[PDB]
Design an enzyme around this catalytic site. Structure first.
Site, PDB file in Angstrom:
ATOM      1  N   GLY A 143       3.444   6.880   8.462  1.00  0.00           N
ATOM      2  CA  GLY A 143       4.788   7.399   8.064  1.00  0.00           C
ATOM      3  C   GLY A 143       5.822   6.310   8.316  1.00  0.00           C
ATOM      4  N   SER A 192       4.898   3.055   8.062  1.00  0.00           N
ATOM      5  CA  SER A 192       4.452   1.973   7.112  1.00  0.00           C
ATOM      6  C   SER A 192       5.483   1.660   6.053  1.00  0.00           C
ATOM      7  CB  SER A 192       3.204   2.413   6.425  1.00  0.00           C
ATOM      8  OG  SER A 192       2.333   2.780   7.499  1.00  0.00           O
ATOM      9  N   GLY A 193       5.640   0.398   5.787  1.00  0.00           N
ATOM     10  CA  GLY A 193       6.613  -0.050   4.769  1.00  0.00           C
ATOM     11  C   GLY A 193       7.988  -0.334   5.382  1.00  0.00           C
ATOM     12  N   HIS A 203       0.822  -1.230   0.000  1.00  0.00           N
ATOM     13  CA  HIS A 203       0.000   0.000   0.000  1.00  0.00           C
ATOM     14  C   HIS A 203       0.853   1.277   0.000  1.00  0.00           C
ATOM     15  CE1 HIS A 203       0.457  -0.160   4.532  1.00  0.00           C
ATOM     16  NE2 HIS A 203       0.247   1.129   4.494  1.00  0.00           N
ATOM     17  N   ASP A 256       0.580  -7.671   2.006  1.00  0.00           N
ATOM     18  CA  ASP A 256       1.024  -6.258   1.859  1.00  0.00           C
ATOM     19  C   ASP A 256       2.566  -6.157   1.788  1.00  0.00           C
ATOM     20  OD1 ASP A 256       0.797  -3.402   1.857  1.00  0.00           O
ATOM     21  OD2 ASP A 256       0.573  -3.355   4.005  1.00  0.00           O
TER      22      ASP A 256
HETATM   23  N1  LIG Z   1       1.023   0.260  14.495  1.00  0.00           N
HETATM   24  C1  LIG Z   1      -0.006   0.949  14.075  1.00  0.00           C
HETATM   25  N2  LIG Z   1      -1.002   1.239  14.885  1.00  0.00           N
HETATM   26  C2  LIG Z   1       0.037   1.369  12.721  1.00  0.00           C
HETATM   27  C3  LIG Z   1      -0.642   2.541  12.340  1.00  0.00           C
HETATM   28  C4  LIG Z   1      -0.576   2.980  11.009  1.00  0.00           C
HETATM   29  N3  LIG Z   1      -1.181   4.050  10.515  1.00  0.00           N
HETATM   30  C5  LIG Z   1      -0.792   4.020   9.249  1.00  0.00           C
HETATM   31  C6  LIG Z   1      -1.229   4.915   8.245  1.00  0.00           C
HETATM   32  C7  LIG Z   1      -2.326   5.771   8.445  1.00  0.00           C
HETATM   33  C8  LIG Z   1      -2.749   6.637   7.431  1.00  0.00           C
HETATM   34  C9  LIG Z   1      -2.099   6.651   6.213  1.00  0.00           C
HETATM   35  C10 LIG Z   1      -1.000   5.820   6.000  1.00  0.00           C
HETATM   36  C11 LIG Z   1      -0.342   5.862   4.772  1.00  0.00           C
HETATM   37  C12 LIG Z   1      -0.310   4.763   3.924  1.00  0.00           C
HETATM   38  C13 LIG Z   1       0.360   4.839   2.703  1.00  0.00           C
HETATM   39  C14 LIG Z   1       0.984   6.003   2.318  1.00  0.00           C
HETATM   40  C15 LIG Z   1       0.963   7.101   3.160  1.00  0.00           C
HETATM   41  C16 LIG Z   1       0.308   7.036   4.391  1.00  0.00           C
HETATM   42  C17 LIG Z   1      -0.571   4.949   7.011  1.00  0.00           C
HETATM   43  O1  LIG Z   1       0.502   4.095   6.793  1.00  0.00           O
HETATM   44  N4  LIG Z   1      -0.041   2.972   8.999  1.00  0.00           N
HETATM   45  C18 LIG Z   1       0.128   2.302  10.098  1.00  0.00           C
HETATM   46  C19 LIG Z   1       0.817   1.140  10.408  1.00  0.00           C
HETATM   47  C20 LIG Z   1       0.783   0.650  11.734  1.00  0.00           C
HETATM   48 CL1  LIG Z   1       1.639  -0.898  12.025  1.00  0.00          CL
END
Ligand SMILES: NC(=[NH2+])c1cc2nc(-c3cccc(-c4ccccc4)c3[O-])[nH]c2cc1Cl
Ligand SMILES: [Ca+2]
Length: 223
Positions: free
Chosen positions: A175, A177-178, A40, A84
């Protein structure tokens, strides 16, 4: 990263920043020409930034390389986030050194209780948005599958695992993520999703890299 600490410049040499005019996702360098990130996080026009610490200042050690191609997993499901994972091939190979190094792929999956290092330039607030300039780190354990499924009933597939603290306060966030989840020197996970950041009983969910090692190897070998 919420509740984490400043890593220290270049102490996580495999961490990369995916940039399209701003930092939007993290990734991990696995060899001089390939990076692994989350499906994603895919978009066109990605510039991979290696050797970074402060992502807003060129301090030296940085290598900015364009992605030649991004390969999202063919079975990636955007509604469940199952599979993913994405591989990004770099236009030129990176010069590896002590500040820019690749991380190894696992040979076996990790067990619950394994302590891992999660890093990234993602949000540092649970409630609100505060993005850091330098790389943050967090040490977090892999939870048991029963605790993970209890937290996210019906949403965890066998290609995901939870890591973190059920009390809340420390977690990965937007931020991040990935980016990498490294345990005993092997890349075991990829920051994928969670409900909010650092909420009680809502740990982060990570892509289980050990289930994709043959896929990664075969895909790199034919590209
Ligand atoms: N550990 C967590 N609680 C968590 C929260 C997140 N929140 C995000 C997220 C939320 C909004 C937008 C993006 C996003 C996705 C792709 C590109 C840019 C932002 C996120 O990765 N990724 C996440 C990944 C995790 Cl593991
Ligand atoms: Ca910089």
């Amino acid at each position: 990263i919420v509740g984490g600490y400043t890593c220290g410049a270049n102490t996580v040499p495999y961490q990369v920043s995916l940039n399209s005019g701003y930092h939007f996702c993290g990734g991990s360098l696995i060899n001089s020409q390939w990076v692994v990130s989350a499906a994603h996080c895919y978009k066109s026009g990605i510039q991979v930034r290696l050797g970074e610490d402060n992502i807003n200042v060129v301090e030296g050690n940085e290598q900015f390389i364009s992605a030649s191609k991004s390969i999202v997993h063919p079975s990636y499901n955007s509604n469940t986030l199952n599979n993913d994972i994405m591989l990004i091939k770099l236009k030129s190979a990176a010069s590896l050194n002590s500040r820019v190094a690749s991380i190894s792929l696992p040979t076996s999956c990790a067990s619950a209780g394994t302590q891992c290092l999660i890093s990234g330039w993602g949000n540092t607030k649970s409630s609100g948005t505060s993005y850091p300039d330098v790389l943050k780190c967090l040490k977090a354990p892999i939870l048991s599958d029963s605790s993970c499924k209890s937290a996210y009933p019906g949403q965890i597939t066998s290609n995901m695992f939870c890591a973190g603290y059920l009390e809340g306060g420390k977690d990965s966030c937007q931020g991040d993520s990935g980016g990498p989840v490294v345990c005993s020197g092997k890349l075991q996970g990829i920051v994928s999703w969670g409900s909010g950041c650092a909420q009680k009983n809502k740990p982060g969910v990570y892509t289980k890299v050990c289930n994709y090692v043959s896929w990664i190897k075969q895909t790199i070998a034919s590209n």
